[PDB]
Each structure stands twice: as structure tokens, then as C-alpha cells.
């Protein structure tokens, strides 16, 4: 009868659904909207805060903030409202009747999952729950048991290698570069054309232009010379005001920041070198199967042409004897949630839920013991 | 006349001076810094590479590269800068009239020593040079002709049993685990409380945090229980921007990785088992002599409490009839250098320099049959 609740709870955008389906029930941006003006028509829908889709359409008069920043929940009083809207409005199911599968990014601070579990039990009174790693679920959903997952969502990027279902914690690599860092770099590079987006309401328009026009290039210098040679890459986009902006060269300069974080004033290496070092950190015997099941996942990896670029870079980094396969599922935007659902539907997993009575024995710290 | 120069130049820090003194003239962090951004202000002087202490002083705008990794020189064109800085800016003496004594960690590729002597002869024009084992000199610094020296530089570790000066080459046990791995693991475990030091400059912040607060406990589980039950192992540190961080359990979790390398993702044995295997790998008639005269050395052995812990582990490993005694000098950090200044100052060592004439008549390979 009862079924577990699978909530991705990823940074930037929130996904939720019931355990045992092939699609997340409800996806809504993790945005908390608050009015920054003072209403003059009282009684016509005055609410102290708008969450989710109502905080997207009304963004013209709202200040919008993200509860999760770089995978870390920065405002718990806002995460509580996001969770309440997820439970009681989008799914319209009480929490006291279903288990809840939260997901967390690797190498996240200690208090994060602790407060997650604490809020899950002390406020919503959930029967059972779990805190699974966001990356490992993608390999489950991919239909494999060996390989390295490259999960680049909105707040955190991370490459995690898994063999035979057991993860290798010593070779987990994390990178604070993410999709919101590309949005910010686009808000900077767009000024060279004569455009100014600085408002949180306009960051959403910048994000929409990004995931509609920008695309990774296969040879960045050759595409730069192509753009400088003849204007044939420019595209027209229409803002909600009706202006017709025109971004040309700026198409691939934004996604390229993934492979060269020096564009963002960061010291670390690109995503390709990140995956390469994460793989070469794995045991030598298993590497032969790793290079064959390199899987992309999450939102930000859905760039046009990212597959060929990743393959070229990793095969130029790895030796020629090795077989490089960048397997890119055509639905990798929800792979984390699909894998979470698959894992939650297992009878073997029906014993891995941290129960309430167990929570009462050792306090929230229990989450550090059960979850891997 | 002329006085011989001694140059340790091990991983992490370069210590050099004149043979005959009881302290190295110049100790500076052997790093090379490249400017990470392009200068905009002129008429104030711009260098393309800051070397030594200048780099650590200006690490906020530099990418820092260590020319030695794990005891094997990885970028020789920076090692030449290190040596040039040593000779001309710190010691302030031309090398073309001063014999030099260099040190090498045992079991390092023959090409390393070969390129070392080739550079020292053809680039700096030194009249003659010699290459001694880095761990052997440290047993001379304690005046012991016999005993087992455990040297743990910032980047390499080696246990060498030496009897009557002739070190036993069949019991010299190498270990890649050292200070730099302890810095990396300290960063990774600091991530647990929410402190993320990731850039190359911040590694020096975490390195200093380790050199200052960390300590090795006698019983790991008891101290874990203590640090869990109360807050009396909490210590506060002040970053160089004014922030104040606080570390508890991480104080001894980081250095204990020397004794249980499993914590760090290493299959090798701890340093206590390494010393015990180095004592067991030699004869049974000198195994006792080695137990009573165990000499520590190197910076990574300057942790408070490592002497008692090493003694406990070894006496638990060794039989009950052997008397254990850990000889921990108060100036271990410079022990390898001091022992050098002795060896070079000997009136019987001056017939063992590889003369430039001898070099050209026999090529670089002569270093493989002159230095033991």
C-alpha cells in the first residue's frame, strides 16, 4: 500500500516523486520568493513568501534566493518551506505515512545531513528515511554496476567511481564549479555585447538563455576563429520585454568555463582533468572497465556537443590502448532521481531505512553510521 | 680558503649552509611560484617566477609548484631555479669555487642522481661534489655509528638500519606516506566541519594548521571517545584573513594516518610496522642493538606524542626481552643537515669528492660507483 517518497533535493532545482516510477512526479526550482516592495491593494493575495512555481512567474516583484548554495543548505528556515511545499502542495501527501529518501552531495559538511535528518523527524514526523549519495544513484539508473559517474548539477560537480556497486570513497572528486557558476560567468561576459543583467529576477532570464543557446565547442580556438572570421553563429533571443538581443561568440565561451576554470578566477582544473585524475586514483585492475563506462549525468552535462568534447579530451589524456566511452543517456537530467527510485524499490533496501525508534537511541548522529 | 657547502634540498624545504657550523645558514620552502594573473601596473618590477620564501610571501597571486614530488624530481627546470636561488640569494657565494654535498633519499631512480650530478657540474660549475644518503647522515648527527634511523621528510619516508656506519642496503624500507599526504588528508577531513581549503595557496594554511595544532595520541580509540564525549580537545586557529576556525577530533585523526595508512587510502603498513620490519629484515645478532638505538628524524616526526606512541607500538610488536628506546633528538628537523656538516668537515672525507676532472674522464655514471 504505502510507497516511499524520493525527493532529489538537488541545489537550484528540486525534484520529487513516489518510489517505483520511471519519472519524477514534480520538478520545481528551489527558489524562495519574497516581496521587496510594499503592497497597496491589501486583501488581493498578500502572502509573506512564494515558493516554487509561484516564485518563478511572480519574479518581477520578488527577491529570489536558493536554500541550497554549492550543495550546502545555507538557510534552514527556507529549506523547511521548500520541503513543506514539496510535501503538502506538489504531491499533496502527508509525510507521516511514507519513507523519505533524501540525497546529498559528497564531501558536504558534517552538520548538513545531521540537520537534514533532524528536520525530517522532529518537524515532519516521517516514519523512515535515508540519506543517499547523489552520484551513486546515477550509475544505478544507467543500468550498470561499474564505471565513474560525472554528476554536474546546479550547485556541485563531482566525479565518483563505483565498481561492482561498491563506491570508492578515496577517489571521490568534488568541484565547486557548477551550472550557477556558468550563469554568473554569462552575466559577466554578456556585458561586452552591451547587455546588463544584475538582478535576481534577471538571473533567471540569464539561466534560460544559457540552457537554450549556449553549447560546448569541440575545438575552442577553431570556433573562436570561426566566429571572428564570419558572423554565422549569432542567435536572436527575446526577453520578456520583447527586446531582441543577439549573442554570437558568447555561445561557447560560457560552457567552456567547465573545462578551464581559470575563466572564473578559479585555480582547479577542468571537468575532463577532474575525471581523469579521479579515474587514475582508482585501483589499476578496475581501470580497464572504468574508461568504458564513463557516464555523464545531471543537468549541466546536457550541453550540445559535450559528449564529443569529453571523449576527445579524456582520450587525449588517457593512453591510446584504453577504450574511452562517454556514455550520455538522453534523459540524464533526472538520472539521480531514477536511481534513487530504483534503490528505494528494492526489498533489500527495506532494511536500510533509519527508523524513528533508532533515531531516538543515538540522536541525529545516527545518520553518520547507517548511510555510506 | 674555501669551505664546503651542504645542501639538503629534500621535498618541501631546502636547507643549505656552510660545512662546519651547527645550524643551516638558509632554510626556505622549496617551491616555485608563477603569477596566476597578468599585471596591469608597470614601473614597479615584474618577475615571471618567484622562488623560495618570496613565493610563500606572495602566495595569494601565485600558482605554487613543488619541484620534487615524493622524493623524485619532477620538473628539473625549477630545481635549477631552486639551486640558483640557494647559491646566489641565500648563501650569497658563487658555486664555482665551493665543493658541495647533496643528499638523496634511498631507492630513488638512478636517473635522478645522474641528472643531479650532471646539472651540478655543467650548469653551476662546482669544482667537485658528493651525494650521500639522506638518512645515513641523520645517524651521524646523533653520533651513533649504529642504530635504525626513521626519516620522515615532508613528502617521503624511509627507515634505514645502519651498523658501524655501513648502512644495510637490504633492510632500507621505503614509504611514500609523509607530511604532504598528511596535509592532503587534513584538508579532506577538515572538509567534515565545513572548512574547504582547496587552492594551492590554502594548502600552506592547512599545512601550518597541521604543523601547529596536530598531535599523535597514545591510544586512538580512547582519545576518540574523549573527543566525542566532551569539548576539551577543541583548539582554535586564526587564518591569515582574520577568520577563526575550530578543530576538535581532527587534531589527532590527521597524524594517526602515519600508523594506519588505511585512513588515507594506502595499502602499505604503518610507520611502526615499517620500523619493525626494518629491524626484523636484518640479522638476529644486531636486531637488539637496533631496538635500543632507534633514532627519529625529519620534520614529520616533530608531532607531540609520537615518541611514546612509537615506543608503545614497537614494544608491542617486538618481543618482551628486547629493551625499546626511541631516541628523539630535540632538533630532528635539521638532523640530516647537521650530520652533513660533520661528514664534510672530516679530514678523511676530502679524498672522496667527485672532481670535475674525474667527471669528464668518466661521465656522469661515475656517481653510481663512487657514492654508496
Amino acid at each position: 500500500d504505502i510507497a516511499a517518497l524520493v525527493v532529489d533535493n538537488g541545489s537550484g532545482m528540486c525534484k520529487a516523486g513516489f518510489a517505483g516510477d520511471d519519472a519524477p512526479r514534480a520538478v520545481f526550482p528551489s527558489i524562495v520568493g519574497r516581496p521587496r516592495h510594499q503592497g497597496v491593494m491589501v486583501g488581493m493575495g498578500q502572502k509573506d513568501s512564494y515558493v516554487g512555481d509561484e516564485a518563478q512567474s511572480k519574479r518581477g516583484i520578488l527577491t529570489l534566493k536558493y536554500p541550497i548554495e554549492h550543495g550546502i543548505v545555507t538557510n534552514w528556515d527556507d529549506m523547511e518551506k521548500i520541503w513543506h511545499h514539496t510535501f503538502y502542495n506538489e504531491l499533496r501527501v502527508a509525510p507521516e505515512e511514507h519513507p523519505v529518501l533524501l540525497t546529498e552531495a559528497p564531501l558536504n559538511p558534517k552538520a548538513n545531513r545531521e540537520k537534514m535528518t533532524q528536520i525530517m523527524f522532529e518537524t515532519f514526523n516521517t516514519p523512515a528515511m535515508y540519506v543517499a549519495i547523489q552520484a551513486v544513484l546515477s550509475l544505478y539508473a544507467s543500468g550498470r554496476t561499474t564505471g565513474i559517474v560525472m554528476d554536474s548539477g546546479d550547485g556541485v560537480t563531482h566525479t565518483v567511481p563505483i565498481y561492482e556497486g561498491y563506491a570508492l570513497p578515496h577517489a571521490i572528486l568534488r568541484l565547486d564549479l557548477a551550472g550557477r557558476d556558468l550563469t554568473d560567468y554569462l552575466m559577466k561576459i554578456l556585458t561586452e555585447r552591451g547587455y546588463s543583467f544584475t538582478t535576481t529576477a534577471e538571473r533567471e532570464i540569464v539561466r534560460d538563455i544559457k540552457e537554450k543557446l549556449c553549447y560546448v565547442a569541440l575545438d575552442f580556438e577553431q570556433e573562436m576563429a570561426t566566429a571572428a572570421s564570419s558572423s554565422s553563429l549569432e542567435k536572436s533571443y527575446e526577453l520578456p520585454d520583447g527586446q531582441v538581443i543577439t549573442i554570437g561568440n558568447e555561445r561557447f565561451r560560457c560552457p567552456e568555463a567547465l573545462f578551464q576554470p581559470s575563466f572564473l578566477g578559479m585555480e582547479s582544473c577542468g571537468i575532463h582533468e577532474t575525471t581523469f585524475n579521479s579515474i587514475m586514483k582508482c585501483d589499476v585492475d578496475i581501470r580497464k572497465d572504468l574508461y568504458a563506462n564513463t557516464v555523464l549525468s545531471g543537468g549541466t552535462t546536457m550541453y550540445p556537443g559535450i559528449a564529443d568534447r569529453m571523449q576527445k579530451e579524456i582520450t587525449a589524456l588517457a593512453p591510446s590502448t584504453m577504450k574511452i566511452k562517454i556514455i550520455a543517456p538522453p534523459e540524464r537530467k533526472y538520472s539521480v532521481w531514477i536511481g534513487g527510485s530504483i534503490l528505494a524499490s528494492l526489498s533489500t533496501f527495506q532494511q536500510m531505512w533509519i527508523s524513528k525508534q533508532e533515531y531516538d537511541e543515538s540522536g541525529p548522529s545516527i545518520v553518520h553510521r547507517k548511510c555510506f | 680558503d674555501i669551505a664546503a657547502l651542504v645542501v639538503d634540498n629534500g621535498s618541501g624545504m631546502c636547507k643549505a649552509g656552510f660545512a662546519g657550523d651547527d645550524a643551516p645558514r638558509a632554510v626556505f620552502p622549496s617551491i616555485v611560484g608563477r603569477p596566476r594573473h597578468q599585471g596591469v601596473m608597470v614601473g614597479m618590477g615584474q618577475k615571471d617566477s618567484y622562488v623560495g620564501d618570496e613565493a610563500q610571501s606572495k602566495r595569494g597571486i601565485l600558482t605554487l609548484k613543488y619541484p620534487i614530488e615524493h622524493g623524485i624530481v619532477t620538473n628539473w627546470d625549477d630545481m635549477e631555479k631552486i639551486w640558483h636561488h640557494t647559491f646566489y640569494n641565500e648563501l650569497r657565494v658563487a658555486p664555482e669555487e665551493h665543493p658541495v654535498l647533496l643528499t638523496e633519499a634511498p631507492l630513488n631512480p638512478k636517473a635522478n642522481r645522474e641528472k643531479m650530478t650532471q646539472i651540478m657540474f655543467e650548469t653551476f660549475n662546482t669544482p667537485a661534489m658528493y651525494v650521500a644518503i639522506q638518512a645515513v647522515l641523520s645517524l651521524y648527527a646523533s653520533g651513533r655509528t649504529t642504530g635504525i634511523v626513521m626519516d620522515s621528510g615532508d613528502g617521503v619516508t624511509h627507515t634505514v638500519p645502519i651498523y658501524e656506519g655501513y648502512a644495510l642496503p637490504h633492510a632500507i624500507l621505503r614509504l611514500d606516506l609523509a607530511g604532504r599526504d598528511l596535509t592532503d588528508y587534513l584538508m579532506k577531513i577538515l572538509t567534515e566541519r565545513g572548512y574547504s581549503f582547496t587552492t594551492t595557496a590554502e594548502r600552506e594554511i592547512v599545512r601550518d594548521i597541521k604543523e601547529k595544532l596536530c598531535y599523535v595520541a597514545l591510544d586512538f580509540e580512547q582519545e576518540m571517545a574523549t573527543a566525542a564525549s566532551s569539548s576539551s580537545l577543541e583548539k582554535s586557529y586564526e587564518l591569515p584573513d582574520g577568520q577563526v576556525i575550530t578543530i576538535g577530533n581532527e587534531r589527532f585523526r590527521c597524524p594517526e594516518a602515519l600508523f594506519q595508512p588505511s585512513f588515507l587510502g594506502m595499502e602499505s603498513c604503518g610507520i611502526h610496522e615499517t620500523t619493525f620490519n626494518s629491524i626484523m629484515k636484518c640479522d638476529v645478532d644486531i636486531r637488539k642493538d637496533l631496538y635500543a638505538n632507534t633514532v627519529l628524524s625529519g620534520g614529520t616526526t616533530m608531532y607531540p606524542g609520537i615518541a611514546d606512541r612509537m615506543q608503545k607500538e614497537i614494544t608491542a610488536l617486538a618481543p618482551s626481552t628486547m629493551k625499546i628506546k626511541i631516541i628523539a633528538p630535540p632538533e630532528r628537523k635539521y638532523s640530516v643537515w647537521i650530520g652533513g656538516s660533520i661528514l664534510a668537515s672530516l679530514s678523511t672525507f676530502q679524498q672522496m669528492w667527485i672532481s670535475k676532472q674525474e667527471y669528464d674522464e668518466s661521465g656522469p655514471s661515475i656517481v653510481h660507483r663512487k657514492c654508496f
Partner: peptide
Amino acid sequence: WXAXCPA
């Protein structure tokens, strides 16, 4: 974050 980086 608390130290290094905002979050």
C-alpha cells in the same frame, strides 16, 4: 561554506 567560498 563557512570558510572559503560563500555557501
